[PDB]
Ligand binder design. Structure first.
Ligand code: SF4
Ligand code: SF4
Ligand code: FES
Ligand code: FES
Ligand SMILES: [Fe+3]
Ligand SMILES: [Fe+3]
Lengths: 633, 633
């Protein structure tokens, strides 16, 4: 079972699933072996009804697509569509939040409001929206309208690219024609250019994909911006993670998906309803998080994280999960079938994300509190039906200190230097206490024993004094293995890094260090790491491709994560990936993405299966950046 | 060779390609056999890096995707993305024309202008744009701005859906939530909902696809609208088709692709340059058409059609094609490799559609005449290099009467009834002279002997008095086999149909009938058949799913054609397809698309391999509609 997951709670539920005959993601993976080598290498195309076409990676025919498409065109077209799909997910999330903010300040959804007035005004300043003499509701309406305008062509490019990156970076991108004209405009243009008998030049195609990945960055950044306005900017919090946060005597309700627009309301209304749950025999309503919508309410409210990604079925296997409330993205559709065995009420809430066999509740922001009550009452009914039923909740959980928004990080640093908060961080980079910065991002993948790459790489970087920040299911992996617990700083961190975490924590009224890893939030909150790295770059007067900053999508899965990895390279970062993407069938495309993209953006993909080898390559990349600044290493 | 193409000129060039060792699309198809059965059935998914996943159509495992996706989810997701890709192609074409019209009336591209003032004003009326007291350039600017606004969400739905379909049809679509909110909005939403861990309900997924297909209809209709404003509404013309329109002593220049924005200019400037071509020893510049941009300038200017679709390489094999001028879509990238053997100068012109090994000329509307000259001079240089070289142009061509825009059809009918032009057509439907209407649309496909389905089905429908209209490469197939020559009416048409074609032609100052098939233009000009059928429906006071009107995408290939077939079903038409789409792996999805979609839109797909059987099923569908109106049959 430790070949499936390094998480001991997950291993325990795998034993239970095995003996109850419940099929899991790992079983479905095993039944799929051996996987198709054409798809694995990227040498398959189904973009027209003359296909499917394939190309032998080596040997005799087929050597070319029926229309004449070469291996390098087929590979670049397939990658481009996965970037566009990722952009469409992060774009759709941001768009829904834009409509919510607009409804809120137009008096149409009273359950929503401007919660962070500081954030609203700083965004409006960043966009060049006039604030002084304006009402908040009119500033916010201007911000929401500007958000919606970035989806289509207009007289400006996408402002959620051009106003978030260092001006030098924008000029480098603009010189290569890489600035997006509109978010949905770029998504559609990718789909057009990759359809049959259109773009057939690998380099032209990949430049389109880099541009589409910045459309995805815009959507990430807009989603983070709008969610902070509506629900508050995260600040440091303490909570717990892993399956042991479930409680047998409570109504256990998981929020699962990505968009917190309803899950933040569920959090609020669930407090309002403890009495109704006590009347059914529960201690209360135990809201817990799965995947990124769980990260959202962990970051803002300290909702304990139940589990993540590949292991999400295991929360049901406990027998104690009474409801699973879904919005969209990364939800294994298997949860709807598994619920018939485990008793869980699986509930979809979004018009464009339904699952056959789940109960659907048509959430509308105008009726959000009423919907949350209808939903939580289904959860209460479910808890009643398992009166007397035995549960197996693994008694396994970790302490999690989280909530490190970029504003929180700057604020924490300001306690060492009030008027120059970034300087203490840069000082310890220069003198070697901080070797560099590594962002862990992206999913788990069934192909990789769960969390194995994240923890192995992080363990080695931390001992080498790398400052480690994490998002999404990378934060999930680290948090479930103790990397967000300050009590483990002594074990995990080098002396230089420990010294810095201790000074910052001691200066923030804690008598203890910051945690070994800084949790910066959900996948769209990868935009927070951009805001931090960009601010560091602007303070040093250099572009991002000169900073000792790297990223590792160590176990990545989703098209969303492919987009993120690509815009990490596009904004200038050495970017490690721990699962082969479908590009090895084309050496020219692999060469572009792993080497020659350096000459365009200064970033590049680092393709490494072995996590120990990956850590060495990440340290080498961090150290080359150090040498380019003339730092010792 | 007749197993590859029923076109005798194509067969002759296949012999030449074979003996010169030049590989063709048919050779590349043969080298790809046997094709992958998982892809053929739709039972493959690569939407995340845990894949590729596949499902055995029958037998033991794998039975489900790794994430839990069922066969019906995987099949519906794959179809949805092909619809979105099609929508993005027709959308991009329309969008480029919208920007061109805006540049033209803003004084920025003097090579473009309002050429059809009648069309501009009728579109503006249809959209509710005020005309009286307004300048043309300000009406047109309003029309262009409204075109661009249909790509994103606004306070109205896509007007290029709601103002083009009968009001009853709009209410039926609106009741099922099928009206698009924005063209690129729907494309992105499809990409989101079909990414991993999102929509997992076949019916929900397919309803999204029907809505996205109407986004494609909007783009088709907008593209036709804008092209008519800019370049003129087609009116009946006489020309020729097939490889024999090439001339050994001329500079033979093919316009190839879909967007006529440059190819219409090439037509104009090529006249301006006969002397420069004569100075190099040519008789002149012989502009000919390939695929839909060729249809565009055939419809408006009588440019002879050289060839289409699957056979496009054959035009090069003659040795006489000096230049091939490409915009985008349906261009076999093989033309760039083949040119090294045949001497042809292959020229790309659009930023997002390049082909490795082709010469790229960066066309801009602001510099259109200068670009056309640079391009035509490359063609002249090429003609010089083949001085004395022998060519093999098959002496095979047909007479083509074309240009039947919906306005041209109404005008032609008006000569039988000035104030009620549709009535003569409806009269002969009622009394049986016209059994019904069949639209042939879409591509050729290497899987089907070229043109075999189109001609076989058309031959049987025409003898049964069906009025046949055609677009795209369906018009190409019919025109290259003599179906657009009035001299063949006696051979091809039933007595009822012949009587009507004769009366209309005789009443239009011809002493001869209309051609056996009415050529209504390019693939976006499928919107013209919609405008005609909608006008017929509005005149009878019924919805389109009550008219004896069918469609046949008899040899379809492109994702664009998948979108068209889907919106033909969505607007209510029985729609035959001649190549299996990747849906047979899911019986529930096949049942929805072939039967139960009837209960939503009244249209349905007719899946039939055998063209003789297809003609019977199309006649049966036409005759059931007749019976529903109480007509004899
Ligand atoms: S687009 Fe080309 S390579 Fe892809 S399926 Fe069609 S013929 Fe094959
Ligand atoms: S989305 Fe599901 S079915 Fe598709 S590749 Fe990923 S795991 Fe497999
Ligand atoms: S041949 Fe297996 S992915 Fe297409
Ligand atoms: S297994 Fe062949 S199309 Fe994927
Ligand atoms: Fe996740
Ligand atoms: Fe074509």
């Amino acid at each position: 079972q430790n070949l499936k997951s390094t998480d001991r709670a997950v291993q325990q539920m795998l034993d239970k699933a095995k003996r109850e005959g419940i099929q899991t993601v790992w079983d479905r993976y095993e039944a799929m072996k051996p996987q198709c080598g054409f798809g694995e290498t990227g040498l398959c195309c189904r973009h027209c009804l003359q296909g499917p076409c394939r190309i032998n990676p080596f040997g005799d025919e087929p050597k070319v697509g029926i229309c004449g498409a070469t291996a390098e065109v087929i590979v670049a077209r397939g990658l481009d569509r996965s970037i566009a799909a990722g952009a469409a997910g992060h774009s759709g999330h941001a768009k829904h939040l834009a409509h919510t903010l607009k409804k809120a300040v137009q008096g149409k959804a009273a359950s929503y409001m401007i919660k962070d007035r500081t954030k609203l005004h700083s965004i409006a300043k960043r966009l060049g929206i006039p604030t002084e003499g304006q009402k908040d509701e009119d500033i916010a309406l201007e911000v929401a309208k500007a958000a919606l305008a970035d989806f289509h062509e207009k007289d400006t490019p996408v402002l959620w690219v051009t106003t978030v990156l260092p001006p030098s970076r924008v000029k480098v991108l603009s010189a290569h024609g890489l600035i997006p004209a509109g978010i949905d405009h770029e998504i559609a243009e990718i789909m057009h250019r990759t359809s049959m008998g259109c773009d057939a030049d690998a380099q032209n195609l990949l430049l389109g994909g880099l541009r589409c990945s910045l459309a995805d960055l815009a959507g990430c950044y807009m989603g983070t911006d709008l969610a902070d306005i509506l629900f508050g900017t995260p600040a440091p919090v303490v909570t717990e993670s892993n399956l042991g946060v479930l409680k047998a005597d409570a109504v256990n309700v998981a929020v699962h998906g990505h968009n917190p627009v309803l899950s933040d309301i569920i959090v609020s209304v669930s407090k309002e309803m403890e009495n109704e749950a006590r009347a059914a025999g529960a201690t209360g309503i135990n809201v817990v998080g799965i995947c990124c919508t769980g990260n959202e309410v962990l970051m803002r409210h300290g909702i304990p994280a139940c589990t993540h990604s590949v292991s999400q079925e295991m929360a049901m296997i406990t027998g104690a999960l009474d409801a699973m409330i879904l919005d969209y993205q990364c939800i294994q559709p298997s949860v709807a079938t598994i619920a018939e065995c485990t008793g869980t009420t699986v509930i979809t809430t979004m018009e464009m994300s339904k699952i056959t066999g789940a109960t659907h509740v048509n959430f509308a922001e105008e009726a959000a509190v009423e919907n949350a009550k209808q939903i939580l009452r289904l959860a209460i009914d479910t808890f009643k039906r398992r009166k007397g039923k035995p549960v197996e909740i693994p008694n396994i959980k970790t302490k999690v200190v989280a909530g490190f928004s970029t504003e929180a990080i700057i604020n924490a640093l300001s306690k060492l230097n009030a008027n120059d908060p970034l300087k203490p961080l840069i000082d310890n980079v220069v003198n070697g206490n901080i070797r560099g910065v590594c962002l862990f991002a992206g999913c788990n993948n069934v192909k990789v024993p769960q969390d194995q790459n994240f923890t192995t790489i992080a363990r080695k970087l931390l001992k080498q004094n790398v400052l480690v920040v994490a998002t999404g299911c990378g934060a999930g992996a680290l948090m479930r293995h103790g990397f967000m617990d300050p009590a483990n700083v002594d074990e995990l961190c080098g002396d230089g890094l420990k010294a810095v975490l201790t000074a910052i924590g001691e200066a923030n009224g804690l008598g203890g260090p910051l945690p070994p890893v800084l949790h910066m939030g959900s996948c769209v909150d990868n935009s927070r790491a951009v805001a931090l790295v960009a601010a560091l770059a602007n303070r040093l007067g250099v572009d991002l491709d000169r900073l000792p900053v790297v990223a590792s999508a160590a176990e990545w899965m989703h098209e969303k994560a492919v987009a993120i990895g690509t815009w990490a390279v596009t904004i200038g970062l050495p970017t490690h990936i721990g699962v082969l993407p479908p590009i090895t069938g084309s050496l020219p495309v692999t060469q572009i993405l792993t080497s020659s993209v350096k000459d365009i953006t200064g970033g590049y993909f680092i393709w490494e299966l072995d996590p120990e080898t990956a850590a060495d390559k990440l340290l080498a990349a961090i150290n080359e950046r150090r040498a380019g600044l003339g730092l010792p290493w």
